[PDB]
Amino acid sequence: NADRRYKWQTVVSEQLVGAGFNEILNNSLTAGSYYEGLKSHPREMAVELMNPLSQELNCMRQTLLFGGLETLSHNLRRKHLSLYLFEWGKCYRFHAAKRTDETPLAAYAEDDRLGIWICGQRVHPEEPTSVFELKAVVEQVLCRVGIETGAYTLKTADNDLYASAMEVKTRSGKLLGTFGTVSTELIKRFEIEQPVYFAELLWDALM
């Protein structure tokens, strides 16, 4: 139910704002090139527009990450020293068909996500941010919806969006999300001269 979930959303948003965050909102339209060669979100699983105006800008996003990188790139150019951002938004993919009886792509799928970015200088002298600050806010979001630290563990991930990342996975085996340090190649691509810590939480799993 959209109204009940929205009430929980704003409660989590209140806590992030309290921790110093800004809310952002990015187009679900994105660049196909962002996804070339990824295994975490393959280019071939992208939902493409029909007869788009641009051949470059023609995919729906599979992750919230890149909209965030763009917003970071943009705001780092404008001299923001310290960026703590979050975004609620839907993501989209095709699932590959298991059998070769119809089409290469079977189901279309969408899912709700919370994206969280910390970059630059720590808000409290020369002190940079770290992934530990991100872990701490991630843990507190889980906490705000009644998920205790004993209910899940952090495991090393193999996610090529990241240089290194932990998956948050419940005692029951529900993937809750991922957080870590965005891969070197991806941050260079968006001309970010500095590390970016990103978490992406699966809202359906937290509800």
Question: Rule CB under 8 A: which residues touch a second copy?
Answer: 2-3, 6-7, 10, 13-14, 16-17, 21-29, 49-53, 60, 71, 75, 105, 107-110
In the bound complex, what is the minimum distance in angstroms from residue 127's beta carbon to a second copy? 22
**Integer Cα distance of 182 and 99 in angstroms:** 35
* Residue with smaller CB distance to a second copy, 7 or 39: 7
Structure token digits, residue 204: 């359906």
* Residue with smaller CB distance to a second copy, 36 or 50: 50
In the bound complex, what is the minimum distance in angstroms from residue 65's beta carbon to a second copy? 16
In the bound complex, what is the minimum distance in angstroms from residue 28's beta carbon to a second copy? 6
**Integer Cα distance of 67 and 59 in angstroms:** 13
* Residue with smaller CB distance to a second copy, 41 or 61: 61
In the bound complex, what is the minimum distance in angstroms from residue 184's beta carbon to a second copy? 26
User: Which residues 6+ apart lie within 8 Å of 134 measured at CB?
Assistant: 116, 118, 179, 197, 198, 199
Helix axes 2-18, 131-144, angle to 10 degrees: 140
In the bound complex, what is the minimum distance in angstroms from residue 160's beta carbon to a second copy? 25
Residue for token digits 């968006």? 190
**In sequence order, what DSSP letters do the residues of 54-70 get, joined into one string?**
-SSS-EE-S-SHHHHHH
- Residue type for 141, please? V
* Residue with smaller CB distance to a second copy, 86 or 197: 86
* Residue with smaller CB distance to a second copy, 92 or 151: 92
